[PDB]
Amino acid sequence: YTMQRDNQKTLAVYMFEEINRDVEYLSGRLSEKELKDKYRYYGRGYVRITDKDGQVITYEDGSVQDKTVFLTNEGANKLGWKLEFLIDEKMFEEEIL
Amino acid sequence: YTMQRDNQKTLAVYMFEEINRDVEYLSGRLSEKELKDKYRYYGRGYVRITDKDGQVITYEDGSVQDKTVFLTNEGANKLGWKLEFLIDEKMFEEEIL
Amino acid sequence: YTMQRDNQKTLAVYMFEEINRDVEYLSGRLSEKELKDKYRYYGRGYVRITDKDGQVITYEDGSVQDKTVFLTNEGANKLGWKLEFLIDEKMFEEEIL
Amino acid sequence: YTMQRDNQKTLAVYMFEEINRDVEYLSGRLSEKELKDKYRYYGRGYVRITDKDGQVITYEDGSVQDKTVFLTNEGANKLGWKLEFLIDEKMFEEEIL
Amino acid sequence: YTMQRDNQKTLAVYMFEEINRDVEYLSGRLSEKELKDKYRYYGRGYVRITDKDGQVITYEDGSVQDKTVFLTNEGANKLGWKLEFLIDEKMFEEEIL
Amino acid sequence: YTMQRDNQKTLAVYMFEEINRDVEYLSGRLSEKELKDKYRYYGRGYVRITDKDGQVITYEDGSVQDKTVFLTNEGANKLGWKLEFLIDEKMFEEEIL
Ligand SMILES: [K+]
Ligand SMILES: [K+]
Ligand SMILES: [K+]
């Protein structure tokens, strides 16, 4: 067990508990199509952290071509990092239909 | 704007705030390389949600070739959903090196 | 100052912080009308707590004429309390229009 | 299901989980009078958001005459909003006895 | 830096943020003595974790002579751990005076 | 029941729920030595709040000689408070072996 692993654990557990808590309440109210549509993209987004000189800190793979920057945080980070939140373009494509 | 977008916005802001707060406190103590290392995989993990009949709810594209399941939640979800948290196998490979 | 006041203070600050943070991020993307619409009913919902013998614990004045129960929690509370979350029926009426 | 509804859901669930978690711990320790007195006003407070020109964004009804501003947030919101947290005057009247 | 250190850092930052936020809101309303009184024991409580075989997991030095168990959690932990929250008996002594 | 007690309750419950949630996930994955080593010092750290004139607001006892300042917050508090987070020196001594 390492710090990196414990940090991943904390994100995972955040998401697990949110998903389970939500379902406990919404299952009767929303249809299956509704709840499944709600969770389709949940958690799929990631932050690309770019350092102050343009060097990407976040590990990325070839997938990135199919992702779209949805939200941006700039000028807030004390090391001059830029944070971009990227989600599947497929989500926007399905919304448009 | 939609509910889905707002949900994405909530995950985004959670991670933007976490990253910026941490950097504010750790900046002095850790080296840039140490913080970069800390954030290399931060937020790259995602959940794969499977319903009780084995049908995947989460959008999936590409392959899980280079992914590994870090954590699983089963038996907790009201709908019988299984939740798996997947991360880059590269992270684990790099821990070896 | 009392415990009750401090509890009220905690709910207050939670909502003040949520509103201000959201506005900070969404300001650019959404129109003022869109954000106003988003916040029209934000925090107007309240809980009505009923004990296991049907006696209401929450202060109530006025009438529930123009309220609707949006969400209920039963069978979870250690004391056998039932919890109902009530919101303005106007919100739902306006969703129709 | 809409964004507005999901947002209400998030407030409701916050309150439900807090109330139930608290009761799980305090029921043995506090008397019934104690815990019921603690929850009498819990969640009844709301924020009145006023825009930068004096126009109230929050929906309000006639009830407002029986409410009292307990806490105020000003100069923090990036759209120049003023946030006022209002609770039943009845709470202050009962404290004074 | 280690996982243990990072965990300590997370508890630290939680309390730093809580203290500073509260002071920001309560500063005007309460007197310095009132806020000082509020924070006299804030964060001095600690948990003692005992495994199912009665062996203490938490580091302990000194004595519990002048401590009191304020809250206990049993029967909830997957490993059969018992959790006790210990605070200065002085706090309770001062509430009498 | 007083505000001070309710505030202690909130810290206690935060820690209890974190410890139990973590164990629910990590017990299978980490060894007993691992999880027990993780929790050895958890919650043992405290904040020493010093007012703007050098007067310590936090109650402290003789124990303090065996504690070490791990993290510091300065210049953020609106009353000019200094916050120092102190942990057992024993933790650092065990890390070094
Ligand atoms: K992700
Ligand atoms: K309310
Ligand atoms: K502590």
Ligand nearest to the CA of A46: 1
Taking CB atoms and an 8 Å cutoff, what residues of chain F touch C7?
Answer: 6
Distance, CA of B20 to chain centre = 18
Under 8 Å between Cβ of C47 and D15: yes
What distance in Å separates the CA atoms of residue B4 and residue A26, rounded to the nearest whole number?
15
Distance, CA of D5 to chain centre = 18
Taking CB atoms and an 8 Å cutoff, what residues of chain E touch F70?
Answer: 5, 8-9, 12
Under 8 Å between Cβ of F78 and F44: no
Q: Which of D34, C92, F28 is nearest to E79 (CA)?
A: F28
Angular region, A22: left φ>0, alpha ψ -120 to 50, beta rest: alpha
Q: Which of C35, A57, F40, A32 is nearest to B51 (CA)?
A: A32
C25 to chain E, any CB pair closer than 8 A? The answer is no
Closest approach of A30 to chain D, Cα-based (Å): 7
- Domains, chain E, ordered by start: 1-97 (3.30.2200.10)
Ligand nearest to the CA of A86: 1
Q: Which two tokens stand for residue A92?
A: 């926007």
User: Which chains border E (3 or more CB–CB pairs < 8 Å)?
Assistant: A, B, C, F
* C94 CB-near residues (< 8 Å, 6+ apart): none
Under 8 Å between Cβ of B40 and A59: yes
3-state SS class at A78: coil
CA of E13 to the centre of ligand 3 (A): 13
Taking CB atoms and an 8 Å cutoff, what residues of chain C touch B1?
Answer: 29-30, 34
Q: Structure resolution in Å? A: 1.9
E78 to chain A, any CB pair closer than 8 A? The answer is no
Q: How was this structure determined?
A: X-ray
Quick one: angle between helices A3-26 and E3-26, nearest 10?
A: 60
Mutate to test the interface with F, among E55, E57, E86 (most CBs of F within 10 A): E57
3-state SS class at F34: helix
